[PDB]
Scaffold this active site. Structure first.
Site, PDB file in Angstrom:
ATOM      1  N   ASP A 116      -2.436  11.013  15.712  1.00 31.46           N
ATOM      2  CA  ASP A 116      -1.042  11.549  14.948  1.00 31.46           C
ATOM      3  C   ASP A 116      -0.277  12.031  15.577  1.00 31.46           C
ATOM      4  O   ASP A 116       0.105  12.930  16.653  1.00 31.46           O
ATOM      5  CB  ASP A 116      -1.296  11.063  13.572  1.00 31.46           C
ATOM      6  N   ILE A 127       2.613  -9.923   7.703  1.00 34.12           N
ATOM      7  CA  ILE A 127       1.610  -9.767   6.707  1.00 34.12           C
ATOM      8  C   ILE A 127       0.841  -8.241   6.794  1.00 34.12           C
ATOM      9  O   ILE A 127      -0.114  -7.722   6.408  1.00 34.12           O
ATOM     10  CB  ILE A 127       0.288 -10.646   5.552  1.00 34.12           C
ATOM     11  N   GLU A 139       6.876   4.139   1.959  1.00 33.03           N
ATOM     12  CA  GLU A 139       7.499   3.942   3.128  1.00 33.03           C
ATOM     13  C   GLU A 139       8.474   5.696   2.682  1.00 33.03           C
ATOM     14  O   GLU A 139       8.729   5.373   2.204  1.00 33.03           O
ATOM     15  CB  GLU A 139       8.090   3.506   4.585  1.00 33.03           C
ATOM     16  N   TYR A 169       0.207  -0.472  16.319  1.00 34.54           N
ATOM     17  CA  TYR A 169       0.596  -2.146  16.044  1.00 34.54           C
ATOM     18  C   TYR A 169       2.669  -2.208  16.371  1.00 34.54           C
ATOM     19  O   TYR A 169       2.635  -2.869  15.706  1.00 34.54           O
ATOM     20  CB  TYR A 169       0.219  -2.300  14.382  1.00 34.54           C
ATOM     21  N   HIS A 175      -2.009   6.755  16.751  1.00 36.23           N
ATOM     22  CA  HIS A 175      -1.497   6.182  15.731  1.00 36.23           C
ATOM     23  C   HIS A 175      -0.485   6.586  15.569  1.00 36.23           C
ATOM     24  O   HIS A 175      -0.282   7.445  14.619  1.00 36.23           O
ATOM     25  CB  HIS A 175      -2.986   6.784  14.347  1.00 36.23           C
ATOM     26  N   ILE A 226     -11.528  -9.725  12.319  1.00 37.89           N
ATOM     27  CA  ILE A 226     -10.202  -9.019  12.450  1.00 37.89           C
ATOM     28  C   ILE A 226     -10.840  -8.402  13.085  1.00 37.89           C
ATOM     29  O   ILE A 226      -9.651  -7.583  13.477  1.00 37.89           O
ATOM     30  CB  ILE A 226     -11.042  -7.622  11.201  1.00 37.89           C
ATOM     31  N   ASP A 251      -8.003   0.874  16.094  1.00 38.44           N
ATOM     32  CA  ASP A 251      -8.923   1.111  15.670  1.00 38.44           C
ATOM     33  C   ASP A 251     -10.135  -0.329  15.082  1.00 38.44           C
ATOM     34  O   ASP A 251     -11.203   0.072  14.286  1.00 38.44           O
ATOM     35  CB  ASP A 251      -9.098   1.702  14.406  1.00 38.44           C
ATOM     36  N   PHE A 252      -9.715  -1.795  14.801  1.00 41.96           N
ATOM     37  CA  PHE A 252      -9.811  -2.730  15.034  1.00 41.96           C
ATOM     38  C   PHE A 252     -10.658  -3.471  15.844  1.00 41.96           C
ATOM     39  O   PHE A 252     -11.655  -4.322  15.799  1.00 41.96           O
ATOM     40  CB  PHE A 252      -8.900  -3.952  14.480  1.00 41.96           C
ATOM     41  N   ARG A 306      -8.315  10.430  16.106  1.00 45.00           N
ATOM     42  CA  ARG A 306      -7.310   9.558  15.967  1.00 45.00           C
ATOM     43  C   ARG A 306      -6.347  10.051  16.202  1.00 45.00           C
ATOM     44  O   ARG A 306      -5.516  11.678  15.114  1.00 45.00           O
ATOM     45  CB  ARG A 306      -7.405   8.550  14.750  1.00 45.00           C
ATOM     46  N   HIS A 343       1.954   3.669   1.804  1.00 43.58           N
ATOM     47  CA  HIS A 343       2.658   4.476   2.315  1.00 43.58           C
ATOM     48  C   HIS A 343       3.332   5.486   2.997  1.00 43.58           C
ATOM     49  O   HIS A 343       4.010   6.114   3.932  1.00 43.58           O
ATOM     50  CB  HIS A 343       3.069   3.687   3.776  1.00 43.58           C
ATOM     51  N   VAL A 395       1.117  -0.887   0.230  1.00 40.82           N
ATOM     52  CA  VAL A 395      -0.337   0.459   0.158  1.00 40.82           C
ATOM     53  C   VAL A 395       0.790   0.891  -0.069  1.00 40.82           C
ATOM     54  O   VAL A 395       2.038   1.491   0.163  1.00 40.82           O
ATOM     55  CB  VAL A 395      -0.833   0.008   0.921  1.00 40.82           C
TER      56      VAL A 395
END
Lengths: 437, 443, 437
Positions: B161, B442, B377, B265, B349, B309, B297-298, B159, B130, B128
């Site tokens: 950041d 992953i 990234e 995470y 985050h 999830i 957030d999950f 959220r 990032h 993705v």
């Protein structure tokens, strides 16, 4: 229909959307538009100009070209200028430095020689082809044409978005010029000298003598159209179209030329119009708005006699047609704005036709130089706001000449000028000069 | 002379000089929203918005409308939006953003605000976008945040950041130019505001070639700054041997005193864990600030219907608990400090790395195996050898920590036994067949 | 507008004059037209075909090529055929003899390998490019395709004079094929063997996987246009256009294919049309009009089972859609004319679109082979006389199938065939076969 209208009726014509024609009215706008289109180009940039100068204005453009090619290496960027003009520390030397100071980035600069010597043919082809658009001006790329730094050279500026026309012009340049004999890179430090390619140029010129656009017309005479034209020499399609265009004026013909020096055939047309009771407007520069004019304080040079010779031409013409001035049929305008210079070309036929061209409408352009144009047919008056605004602003810095006597005579000229001109007319060289410049 | 290979790596990084006056921190998502809007209004030359996504919600609308408005008032302004190709063309977990980008373009004719989709791999799970950065004229407003309700603190829930505005002509040029050449003009980038945009399978081969081009695309620029002055070094990478990844690796051992890490995470690659353990053995300090499971957030409240999830926060907790378990000795000596962030049902985050008082990595990098191999990234590396940003650095860390508990014992974290029944059964099933290890590589 | 029409609306399109599109209706006319255009060619001849056979028909063409090159040595003559097909006394051996028996005269024959083995990719690119025209047929060059000697193979034949399109196709062939890795001359006695160039072919195939025409559209959707298309593999622009084309049928879709073996995705489209109440016509060959069909008197060979397998496909399809046959929505036609063979390809969408292609519309063509087409957009119905005459004659040798039972079942087949097919279906190889042929 008379043979003149027939010629125009049967011209191939490409259709054109009114939304895709943008006029610009000032050299500064033209600069910014050129830069904008260079940035946003996605496929191709083809810059054809008489010259691209080693000055702030020209640097701006060349740097923007290198920058666009860096950001999109798949972009097809080409610059074509006159071979001879670029080599008189020259522009060609500068094009070499630029290429060395920007390795990896491929921006080729080709020199086109239209004849073996500059005086016998120059590249007066005009067009910035960017993707599916043509930004068409008589302007070369330097300080004054781009109105860098406070002094300007007045030209005309039209952006025309049209896939087919731009393709035709891009493709014509590719095949006839870029891949022509005797075209040579000016960014090569080892570029040949003129004598070494003399024979190549002769063969090249002959190839050009009958190179013309070939395309099928897609548009009738009831809709907005554009017709690209190109020519070298007396019997080109351009020259024929210019000749036939003038008599189609049912009301009025307008002409811009920087150097008043019309070939006899175009003069005869003008006189016919005046006799038929039509109107003719002629917009030229004052002698002081000519770029060869040297202020009377500075040291006089031989070349600074040209503006005077063009004035003598204008005064002789007006002299013969003063009757038509008085009936308000013939209108002659002198453009002048401090020490800025005049470089307007074109032809308006009533409200229906607009020729935009690089053609100075002089014997040189008629025989010697590679010329081109776009012929806009607007039978529905869709460009009327812009046409009128453009003419408004062109005229703004003009005086109307109501009498040929309002123009200075040779007697009124500075002494060195006066002596030079009398010397020239003694031996009849004035007539030769008017055929080579 | 001599120097250890880690400091040598950092000493020889190209560095762009930076004025202390031209670095502005923001400490709250709402300030970040307002700053973004302000800079969009006042932009004069260019706006380049790169984000993971730009959501079809009040928050995202606000931003897109402000972009259209700025372009209307200055049509010469160069406005571009780049988001992830795959993310923009799907719902969250249950009418897409790309469909919305199309409507917007139709409802605003004349005004040219192109939205490009960047596919970093053929399928979302394998790469993705990032890359992070809002490039506005000569500034970069750099955050991990995407543009939606919570990231922008529209409507009462947020959220968390980090938010840094850095005015720097050269750096912004380097980043703007890198995006232009490598992403915008890259193969397989495709407009999302085009109703006729291709479907992923049709551009599959373009994306493969694109990804390979990206594998060694790096910033190229000459360093203008020595190691005695305030500097910034933009970094970008895709895959194990990127310059970013190498810099992150070398950065950690340069801590003469203390290393601080934020990650949403907790799922550090083994190599970064080994570094951590070496620091702890050398007698240095290591601070790790992560979210509580409930700030993920999950996370699904235990009253609501459980979904597969909603097991991720638990898996990240298991990672944290296993790590702490092994290093409890260092917790006790006040060397290793683990913080759990938690503020009602707001989400966490934070990303970054502090090396002593001298280096600050601001990045989108979650410091997990995914970010190390799969995703595109980037970061900015701030070198502040003279402590000129000390007021702001300290204020930022103050506020980050404010909603944190220190974990003094691995037992303070719940064990699998304490988890809800559906979760417990799922996790036991996964660990039976060893799929837990795959999942952590992953996501 | 729906996503399918949008796809077609936004296709780049080259404008086209109705006068410059000539249909031919019989293989003999096609032969003569090809010979005529070879004689009168002035600049270039580019012959791309699956094969050029060492028979009377093929000789005729190769001799006409040598003859045209002798009379105009500046003429750019190239022949490109499939590498593998030409080498199975072979055609390649014959191309060598020809080159030796005609010294001085340069007619290069290149072999294109689309994959390392024939079964995994063949050159299904089609086009005879002659100056500014393309004579486009599915036909290779041999006795039956050219209707030498009394027996013929039915294909379609369109001559399209169009400078831009022919340039695009000529230039695409030049860069991607002729100058591609692993292309090798077949008129060289020392040509490599397949294994020696195996790696070249692998890299070549990958280069081809995203080789596509790049050109700017010059024509809107209100005028007659042509759009060249080319593709290799599932996600080619051709394949996408074929997919989107079918749902644009507001009234009726017509399909020709030699071997009825449609991919599932095209079948689903067909069924959607039938459900929407539209019409679908499918024109295929009878098993006996297939070139692999072996009369029941002659010795049976394994390959002579293919026509039967295609019939089984047709019967299975019809079986499922018998309802739509009955409502006169679905029409299936079997072509058959003594022992002549059927090789029609194409797609008609209402009266507005005509796809002419080499594409057999099967899984092979969808993944393995290099395919191309021209998409004719005729929104003003200017080709209506010719379109209708062509369909008239195509249908003339057809029976309409009113019931799936009118097609023979496996039980009705000869014994060797029946045993073979039962053996194949036992182990499920029938499904594999339908994906490789």
């Amino acid at each position: 229909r008379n043979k003149h209208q027939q010629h125009l009726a049967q011209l191939p014509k490409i259709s054109q959307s009114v939304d895709d024609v943008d006029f610009f009215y000032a050299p500064a706008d033209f600069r910014e538009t050129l830069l904008e289109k260079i940035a946003s180009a996605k496929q191709r940039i083809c810059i054809v100009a008489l010259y691209l100068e080693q000055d702030d204005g020209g640097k701006g453009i060349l740097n923007a070209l290198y920058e666009a090619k860096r950001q999109r290496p798949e972009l097809d960027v080409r610059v074509l200028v006159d071979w001879h003009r670029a080599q008189r520390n020259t522009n060609a030397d500068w094009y070499c430095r630029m290429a060395q100071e920007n390795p990896g980035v491929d921006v080729p600069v080709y020199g086109v020689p239209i004849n073996t010597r500059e005086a016998l043919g120059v590249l007066h082809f005009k067009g910035f082809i960017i993707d599916d658009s043509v930004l068409y001006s008589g302007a070369s790329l330097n300080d004054v044409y781009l109105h860098q730094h406070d002094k300007y050279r007045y030209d005309r500026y039209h952006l025309i978005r049209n896939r087919k026309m731009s393709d035709i012009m891009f493709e014509w340049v590719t095949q006839n010029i870029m891949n022509g004999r005797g075209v040579n890179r000016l960014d090569d430090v080892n570029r040949p000298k003129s004598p070494e390619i003399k024979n190549d140029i002769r063969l090249f010129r002959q190839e050009l003598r009958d190179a013309a656009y070939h395309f099928q017309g897609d548009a009738d005479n009831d809709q907005l159209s554009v017709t690209p034209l190109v020519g070298l020499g007396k019997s080109s399609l351009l020259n024929k179209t210019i000749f036939h265009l003038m008599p189609c004026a049912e009301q009025k013909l307008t002409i811009c030329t920087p150097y008043f020096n019309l070939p006899a055939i175009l003069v005869r047309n003008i006189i016919q119009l005046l006799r038929e009771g039509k109107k003719v407007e002629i917009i030229v520069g004052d002698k002081t708005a000519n770029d060869f004019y040297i202020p009377e304080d500075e040291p006089f040079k031989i070349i600074g006699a040209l503006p005077y010779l063009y004035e003598i031409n204008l005064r002789r013409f007006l002299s013969r047609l003063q009757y038509y001035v008085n009936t308000d049929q013939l209108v002659v305008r002198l453009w002048k704005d401090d020490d800025n210079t005049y470089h307007l070309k074109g032809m308006w036929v009533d409200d229906k036709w607009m020729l935009i061209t690089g053609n100075n409408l002089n014997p040189r352009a008629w025989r010697l130089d590679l010329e081109n144009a776009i012929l806009i047919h607007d039978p529905q008056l869709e460009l009327a706001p812009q046409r009128e605004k453009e003419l408004e602003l062109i005229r703004e810095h003009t005086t109307i000449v109501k009498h040929y006597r309002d123009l200075q005579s040779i007697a009124d000229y500075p002494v060195k000028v006066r002596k030079l001109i009398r010397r020239l007319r003694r031996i009849r060289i004035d007539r030769l000069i008017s055929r080579i410049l």
